[PDB]
PDB file of N, CA, C and O and ligand atoms in Angstrom:
ATOM      1  N   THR H   1       0.826  -1.200   0.000  1.00 44.73           N
ATOM      2  CA  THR H   1       0.000   0.000   0.000  1.00 44.73           C
ATOM      3  C   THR H   1       0.867   1.260   0.000  1.00 44.73           C
ATOM      4  O   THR H   1       0.367   2.363   0.213  1.00 44.73           O
ATOM      5  N   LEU H   2       2.170   1.089  -0.234  1.00 44.38           N
ATOM      6  CA  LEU H   2       3.085   2.229  -0.204  1.00 44.38           C
ATOM      7  C   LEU H   2       2.699   3.281  -1.241  1.00 44.38           C
ATOM      8  O   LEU H   2       2.633   4.477  -0.933  1.00 44.38           O
ATOM      9  N   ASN H   3       2.450   2.852  -2.483  1.00 42.63           N
ATOM     10  CA  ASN H   3       2.068   3.803  -3.524  1.00 42.63           C
ATOM     11  C   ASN H   3       0.790   4.531  -3.130  1.00 42.63           C
ATOM     12  O   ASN H   3       0.659   5.744  -3.348  1.00 42.63           O
ATOM     13  N   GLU H   4      -0.169   3.796  -2.557  1.00 42.49           N
ATOM     14  CA  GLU H   4      -1.411   4.400  -2.093  1.00 42.49           C
ATOM     15  C   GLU H   4      -1.132   5.460  -1.034  1.00 42.49           C
ATOM     16  O   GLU H   4      -1.689   6.560  -1.077  1.00 42.49           O
ATOM     17  N   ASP H   5      -0.279   5.134  -0.060  1.00 41.60           N
ATOM     18  CA  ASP H   5       0.029   6.093   0.995  1.00 41.60           C
ATOM     19  C   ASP H   5       0.668   7.350   0.417  1.00 41.60           C
ATOM     20  O   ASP H   5       0.322   8.469   0.813  1.00 41.60           O
ATOM     21  N   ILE H   6       1.601   7.188  -0.526  1.00 42.65           N
ATOM     22  CA  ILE H   6       2.266   8.350  -1.117  1.00 42.65           C
ATOM     23  C   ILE H   6       1.255   9.217  -1.863  1.00 42.65           C
ATOM     24  O   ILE H   6       1.222  10.446  -1.706  1.00 42.65           O
ATOM     25  N   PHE H   7       0.408   8.586  -2.677  1.00 41.03           N
ATOM     26  CA  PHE H   7      -0.592   9.337  -3.426  1.00 41.03           C
ATOM     27  C   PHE H   7      -1.557  10.064  -2.501  1.00 41.03           C
ATOM     28  O   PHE H   7      -1.906  11.222  -2.749  1.00 41.03           O
ATOM     29  N   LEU H   8      -2.006   9.400  -1.433  1.00 42.81           N
ATOM     30  CA  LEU H   8      -2.961  10.024  -0.523  1.00 42.81           C
ATOM     31  C   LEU H   8      -2.329  11.171   0.255  1.00 42.81           C
ATOM     32  O   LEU H   8      -2.965  12.209   0.464  1.00 42.81           O
ATOM     33  N   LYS H   9      -1.089  10.993   0.724  1.00 42.81           N
ATOM     34  CA  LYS H   9      -0.426  12.064   1.462  1.00 42.81           C
ATOM     35  C   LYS H   9      -0.194  13.273   0.565  1.00 42.81           C
ATOM     36  O   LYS H   9      -0.451  14.421   0.964  1.00 42.81           O
ATOM     37  N   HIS H  10       0.262  13.032  -0.666  1.00 46.60           N
ATOM     38  CA  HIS H  10       0.443  14.138  -1.596  1.00 46.60           C
ATOM     39  C   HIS H  10      -0.892  14.796  -1.925  1.00 46.60           C
ATOM     40  O   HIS H  10      -0.969  16.020  -2.055  1.00 46.60           O
ATOM     41  N   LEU H  11      -1.962  14.000  -2.054  1.00 45.24           N
ATOM     42  CA  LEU H  11      -3.280  14.560  -2.338  1.00 45.24           C
ATOM     43  C   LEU H  11      -3.770  15.423  -1.189  1.00 45.24           C
ATOM     44  O   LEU H  11      -4.356  16.490  -1.410  1.00 45.24           O
ATOM     45  N   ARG H  12      -3.545  14.978   0.049  1.00 41.01           N
ATOM     46  CA  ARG H  12      -3.878  15.800   1.206  1.00 41.01           C
ATOM     47  C   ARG H  12      -3.150  17.135   1.140  1.00 41.01           C
ATOM     48  O   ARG H  12      -3.749  18.201   1.337  1.00 41.01           O
ATOM     49  N   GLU H  13      -1.843  17.089   0.867  1.00 41.52           N
ATOM     50  CA  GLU H  13      -1.077  18.328   0.784  1.00 41.52           C
ATOM     51  C   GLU H  13      -1.604  19.214  -0.338  1.00 41.52           C
ATOM     52  O   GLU H  13      -1.653  20.440  -0.199  1.00 41.52           O
ATOM     53  N   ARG H  14      -1.977  18.612  -1.468  1.00 41.75           N
ATOM     54  CA  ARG H  14      -2.514  19.391  -2.577  1.00 41.75           C
ATOM     55  C   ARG H  14      -3.805  20.087  -2.181  1.00 41.75           C
ATOM     56  O   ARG H  14      -4.036  21.239  -2.558  1.00 41.75           O
ATOM     57  N   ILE H  15      -4.668  19.390  -1.438  1.00 40.30           N
ATOM     58  CA  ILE H  15      -5.916  19.999  -0.983  1.00 40.30           C
ATOM     59  C   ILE H  15      -5.624  21.164  -0.046  1.00 40.30           C
ATOM     60  O   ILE H  15      -6.212  22.249  -0.173  1.00 40.30           O
ATOM     61  N   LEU H  16      -4.698  20.969   0.893  1.00 39.92           N
ATOM     62  CA  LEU H  16      -4.331  22.053   1.802  1.00 39.92           C
ATOM     63  C   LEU H  16      -3.752  23.246   1.044  1.00 39.92           C
ATOM     64  O   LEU H  16      -4.047  24.403   1.369  1.00 39.92           O
ATOM     65  N   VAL H  17      -2.909  22.985   0.042  1.00 39.07           N
ATOM     66  CA  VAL H  17      -2.330  24.062  -0.757  1.00 39.07           C
ATOM     67  C   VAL H  17      -3.416  24.801  -1.523  1.00 39.07           C
ATOM     68  O   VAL H  17      -3.397  26.034  -1.630  1.00 39.07           O
ATOM     69  N   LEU H  18      -4.360  24.060  -2.100  1.00 43.63           N
ATOM     70  CA  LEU H  18      -5.477  24.698  -2.789  1.00 43.63           C
ATOM     71  C   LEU H  18      -6.238  25.615  -1.838  1.00 43.63           C
ATOM     72  O   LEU H  18      -6.572  26.751  -2.188  1.00 43.63           O
ATOM     73  N   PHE H  19      -6.518  25.132  -0.624  1.00 40.82           N
ATOM     74  CA  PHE H  19      -7.250  25.945   0.342  1.00 40.82           C
ATOM     75  C   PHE H  19      -6.466  27.201   0.718  1.00 40.82           C
ATOM     76  O   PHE H  19      -7.036  28.292   0.827  1.00 40.82           O
ATOM     77  N   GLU H  20      -5.155  27.060   0.932  1.00 41.08           N
ATOM     78  CA  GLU H  20      -4.322  28.209   1.283  1.00 41.08           C
ATOM     79  C   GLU H  20      -4.319  29.248   0.167  1.00 41.08           C
ATOM     80  O   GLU H  20      -4.445  30.454   0.423  1.00 41.08           O
ATOM     81  N   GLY H  21      -4.192  28.798  -1.078  1.00 41.06           N
ATOM     82  CA  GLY H  21      -4.259  29.726  -2.192  1.00 41.06           C
ATOM     83  C   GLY H  21      -5.614  30.400  -2.308  1.00 41.06           C
ATOM     84  O   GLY H  21      -5.698  31.606  -2.555  1.00 41.06           O
ATOM     85  N   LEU H  22      -6.694  29.629  -2.142  1.00 39.65           N
ATOM     86  CA  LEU H  22      -8.032  30.201  -2.237  1.00 39.65           C
ATOM     87  C   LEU H  22      -8.249  31.266  -1.170  1.00 39.65           C
ATOM     88  O   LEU H  22      -8.825  32.327  -1.443  1.00 39.65           O
ATOM     89  N   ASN H  23      -7.787  30.999   0.054  1.00 39.80           N
ATOM     90  CA  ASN H  23      -7.929  31.980   1.124  1.00 39.80           C
ATOM     91  C   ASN H  23      -7.089  33.225   0.855  1.00 39.80           C
ATOM     92  O   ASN H  23      -7.539  34.345   1.124  1.00 39.80           O
ATOM     93  N   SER H  24      -5.873  33.062   0.319  1.00 38.97           N
ATOM     94  CA  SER H  24      -5.081  34.240  -0.038  1.00 38.97           C
ATOM     95  C   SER H  24      -5.781  35.075  -1.108  1.00 38.97           C
ATOM     96  O   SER H  24      -5.821  36.311  -1.021  1.00 38.97           O
ATOM     97  N   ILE H  25      -6.329  34.415  -2.130  1.00 36.96           N
ATOM     98  CA  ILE H  25      -6.983  35.148  -3.211  1.00 36.96           C
ATOM     99  C   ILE H  25      -8.189  35.902  -2.680  1.00 36.96           C
ATOM    100  O   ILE H  25      -8.396  37.087  -2.986  1.00 36.96           O
ATOM    101  N   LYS H  26      -9.002  35.224  -1.867  1.00 34.33           N
ATOM    102  CA  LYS H  26     -10.182  35.866  -1.307  1.00 34.33           C
ATOM    103  C   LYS H  26      -9.785  37.033  -0.421  1.00 34.33           C
ATOM    104  O   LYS H  26     -10.412  38.095  -0.469  1.00 34.33           O
ATOM    105  N   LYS H  27      -8.751  36.853   0.407  1.00 32.23           N
ATOM    106  CA  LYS H  27      -8.317  37.940   1.274  1.00 32.23           C
ATOM    107  C   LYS H  27      -7.918  39.158   0.455  1.00 32.23           C
ATOM    108  O   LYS H  27      -8.298  40.286   0.786  1.00 32.23           O
ATOM    109  N   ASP H  28      -7.159  38.955  -0.623  1.00 32.34           N
ATOM    110  CA  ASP H  28      -6.755  40.101  -1.430  1.00 32.34           C
ATOM    111  C   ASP H  28      -7.969  40.799  -2.035  1.00 32.34           C
ATOM    112  O   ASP H  28      -8.073  42.033  -2.001  1.00 32.34           O
ATOM    113  N   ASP H  29      -8.912  40.022  -2.577  1.00 28.27           N
ATOM    114  CA  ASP H  29     -10.086  40.629  -3.202  1.00 28.27           C
ATOM    115  C   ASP H  29     -10.913  41.404  -2.182  1.00 28.27           C
ATOM    116  O   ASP H  29     -11.379  42.523  -2.455  1.00 28.27           O
ATOM    117  N   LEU H  30     -11.107  40.816  -0.998  1.00 26.59           N
ATOM    118  CA  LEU H  30     -11.830  41.496   0.069  1.00 26.59           C
ATOM    119  C   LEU H  30     -11.125  42.784   0.461  1.00 26.59           C
ATOM    120  O   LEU H  30     -11.771  43.808   0.698  1.00 26.59           O
ATOM    121  N   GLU H  31      -9.798  42.742   0.569  1.00 25.09           N
ATOM    122  CA  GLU H  31      -9.055  43.950   0.908  1.00 25.09           C
ATOM    123  C   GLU H  31      -9.302  45.036  -0.128  1.00 25.09           C
ATOM    124  O   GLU H  31      -9.524  46.202   0.224  1.00 25.09           O
ATOM    125  N   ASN H  32      -9.304  44.662  -1.409  1.00 24.70           N
ATOM    126  CA  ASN H  32      -9.540  45.641  -2.468  1.00 24.70           C
ATOM    127  C   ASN H  32     -10.921  46.275  -2.335  1.00 24.70           C
ATOM    128  O   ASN H  32     -11.069  47.506  -2.403  1.00 24.70           O
ATOM    129  N   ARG H  33     -11.949  45.447  -2.131  1.00 22.86           N
ATOM    130  CA  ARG H  33     -13.311  45.979  -2.073  1.00 22.86           C
ATOM    131  C   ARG H  33     -13.546  46.790  -0.804  1.00 22.86           C
ATOM    132  O   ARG H  33     -14.236  47.820  -0.831  1.00 22.86           O
ATOM    133  N   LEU H  34     -12.973  46.347   0.313  1.00 19.17           N
ATOM    134  CA  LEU H  34     -13.067  47.110   1.547  1.00 19.17           C
ATOM    135  C   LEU H  34     -12.380  48.459   1.416  1.00 19.17           C
ATOM    136  O   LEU H  34     -12.897  49.476   1.887  1.00 19.17           O
ATOM    137  N   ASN H  35     -11.204  48.498   0.785  1.00 21.64           N
ATOM    138  CA  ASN H  35     -10.522  49.771   0.589  1.00 21.64           C
ATOM    139  C   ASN H  35     -11.352  50.706  -0.280  1.00 21.64           C
ATOM    140  O   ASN H  35     -11.438  51.908  -0.005  1.00 21.64           O
ATOM    141  N   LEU H  36     -11.975  50.176  -1.334  1.00 21.50           N
ATOM    142  CA  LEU H  36     -12.855  51.009  -2.151  1.00 21.50           C
ATOM    143  C   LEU H  36     -13.992  51.605  -1.321  1.00 21.50           C
ATOM    144  O   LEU H  36     -14.245  52.817  -1.370  1.00 21.50           O
ATOM    145  N   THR H  37     -14.692  50.768  -0.543  1.00 21.64           N
ATOM    146  CA  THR H  37     -15.824  51.290   0.225  1.00 21.64           C
ATOM    147  C   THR H  37     -15.359  52.293   1.274  1.00 21.64           C
ATOM    148  O   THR H  37     -16.012  53.321   1.498  1.00 21.64           O
ATOM    149  N   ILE H  38     -14.239  52.005   1.942  1.00 18.46           N
ATOM    150  CA  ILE H  38     -13.756  52.907   2.982  1.00 18.46           C
ATOM    151  C   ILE H  38     -13.351  54.245   2.375  1.00 18.46           C
ATOM    152  O   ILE H  38     -13.656  55.304   2.933  1.00 18.46           O
ATOM    153  N   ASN H  39     -12.651  54.224   1.233  1.00 17.07           N
ATOM    154  CA  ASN H  39     -12.285  55.476   0.577  1.00 17.07           C
ATOM    155  C   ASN H  39     -13.525  56.249   0.163  1.00 17.07           C
ATOM    156  O   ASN H  39     -13.570  57.478   0.285  1.00 17.07           O
ATOM    157  N   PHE H  40     -14.542  55.548  -0.344  1.00 13.55           N
ATOM    158  CA  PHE H  40     -15.792  56.218  -0.687  1.00 13.55           C
ATOM    159  C   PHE H  40     -16.386  56.910   0.537  1.00 13.55           C
ATOM    160  O   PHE H  40     -16.813  58.069   0.471  1.00 13.55           O
ATOM    161  N   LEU H  41     -16.416  56.216   1.670  1.00 15.85           N
ATOM    162  CA  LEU H  41     -17.041  56.802   2.855  1.00 15.85           C
ATOM    163  C   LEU H  41     -16.223  57.973   3.383  1.00 15.85           C
ATOM    164  O   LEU H  41     -16.786  58.960   3.869  1.00 15.85           O
ATOM    165  N   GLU H  42     -14.893  57.878   3.313  1.00 12.91           N
ATOM    166  CA  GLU H  42     -14.048  58.992   3.739  1.00 12.91           C
ATOM    167  C   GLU H  42     -14.225  60.206   2.835  1.00 12.91           C
ATOM    168  O   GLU H  42     -14.292  61.342   3.325  1.00 12.91           O
ATOM    169  N   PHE H  43     -14.300  59.994   1.522  1.00 13.70           N
ATOM    170  CA  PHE H  43     -14.566  61.105   0.617  1.00 13.70           C
ATOM    171  C   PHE H  43     -15.924  61.728   0.916  1.00 13.70           C
ATOM    172  O   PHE H  43     -16.068  62.955   0.909  1.00 13.70           O
ATOM    173  N   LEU H  44     -16.930  60.895   1.188  1.00 11.02           N
ATOM    174  CA  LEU H  44     -18.248  61.423   1.520  1.00 11.02           C
ATOM    175  C   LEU H  44     -18.201  62.244   2.798  1.00 11.02           C
ATOM    176  O   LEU H  44     -18.782  63.335   2.867  1.00 11.02           O
ATOM    177  N   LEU H  45     -17.503  61.742   3.817  1.00 13.01           N
ATOM    178  CA  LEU H  45     -17.406  62.469   5.079  1.00 13.01           C
ATOM    179  C   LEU H  45     -16.699  63.803   4.889  1.00 13.01           C
ATOM    180  O   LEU H  45     -17.153  64.836   5.403  1.00 13.01           O
ATOM    181  N   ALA H  46     -15.590  63.801   4.146  1.00 13.49           N
ATOM    182  CA  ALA H  46     -14.864  65.040   3.893  1.00 13.49           C
ATOM    183  C   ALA H  46     -15.715  66.035   3.114  1.00 13.49           C
ATOM    184  O   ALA H  46     -15.725  67.230   3.430  1.00 13.49           O
ATOM    185  N   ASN H  47     -16.437  65.562   2.095  1.00 11.26           N
ATOM    186  CA  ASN H  47     -17.294  66.457   1.325  1.00 11.26           C
ATOM    187  C   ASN H  47     -18.397  67.043   2.195  1.00 11.26           C
ATOM    188  O   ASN H  47     -18.704  68.236   2.101  1.00 11.26           O
ATOM    189  N   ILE H  48     -19.005  66.222   3.056  1.00 12.56           N
ATOM    190  CA  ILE H  48     -20.063  66.721   3.930  1.00 12.56           C
ATOM    191  C   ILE H  48     -19.513  67.773   4.883  1.00 12.56           C
ATOM    192  O   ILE H  48     -20.148  68.808   5.124  1.00 12.56           O
ATOM    193  N   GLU H  49     -18.329  67.528   5.449  1.00 12.49           N
ATOM    194  CA  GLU H  49     -17.754  68.501   6.375  1.00 12.49           C
ATOM    195  C   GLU H  49     -17.383  69.801   5.669  1.00 12.49           C
ATOM    196  O   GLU H  49     -17.588  70.891   6.219  1.00 12.49           O
ATOM    197  N   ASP H  50     -16.842  69.710   4.449  1.00  8.93           N
ATOM    198  CA  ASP H  50     -16.568  70.914   3.666  1.00  8.93           C
ATOM    199  C   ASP H  50     -17.858  71.665   3.353  1.00  8.93           C
ATOM    200  O   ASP H  50     -17.875  72.901   3.313  1.00  8.93           O
ATOM    201  N   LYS H  51     -18.939  70.932   3.087  1.00  7.85           N
ATOM    202  CA  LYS H  51     -20.232  71.557   2.840  1.00  7.85           C
ATOM    203  C   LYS H  51     -20.792  72.196   4.104  1.00  7.85           C
ATOM    204  O   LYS H  51     -21.593  73.137   4.026  1.00  7.85           O
ATOM    205  N   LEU H  52     -20.406  71.686   5.272  1.00  5.09           N
ATOM    206  CA  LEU H  52     -20.888  72.251   6.527  1.00  5.09           C
ATOM    207  C   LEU H  52     -20.106  73.494   6.936  1.00  5.09           C
ATOM    208  O   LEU H  52     -20.681  74.418   7.524  1.00  5.09           O
ATOM    209  N   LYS H  53     -18.798  73.535   6.663  1.00  6.56           N
ATOM    210  CA  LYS H  53     -18.024  74.705   7.078  1.00  6.56           C
ATOM    211  C   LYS H  53     -18.469  75.964   6.337  1.00  6.56           C
ATOM    212  O   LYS H  53     -18.417  77.063   6.901  1.00  6.56           O
ATOM    213  N   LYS H  54     -18.939  75.824   5.099  1.00  7.65           N
ATOM    214  CA  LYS H  54     -19.431  76.962   4.327  1.00  7.65           C
ATOM    215  C   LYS H  54     -20.770  77.457   4.878  1.00  7.65           C
ATOM    216  O   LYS H  54     -21.831  76.927   4.542  1.00  7.65           O
TER     217      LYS H  54
HETATM  218 MG1   MG V 101      -0.169  23.958   3.408  1.00 12.00          MG
END
């Protein structure tokens, strides 16, 4: 069963690597979208405050 053990252990590692890559990709995409929304809200806040000082 040696060949079986090698294939299964490598397959486990491949699954873990796939999960690690998927989580990295999702984290980057989430960071991008969060930065967009946060910048939008900061621009809105700054514009509102500039509109209030006048
Ligand atoms: Mg790993």
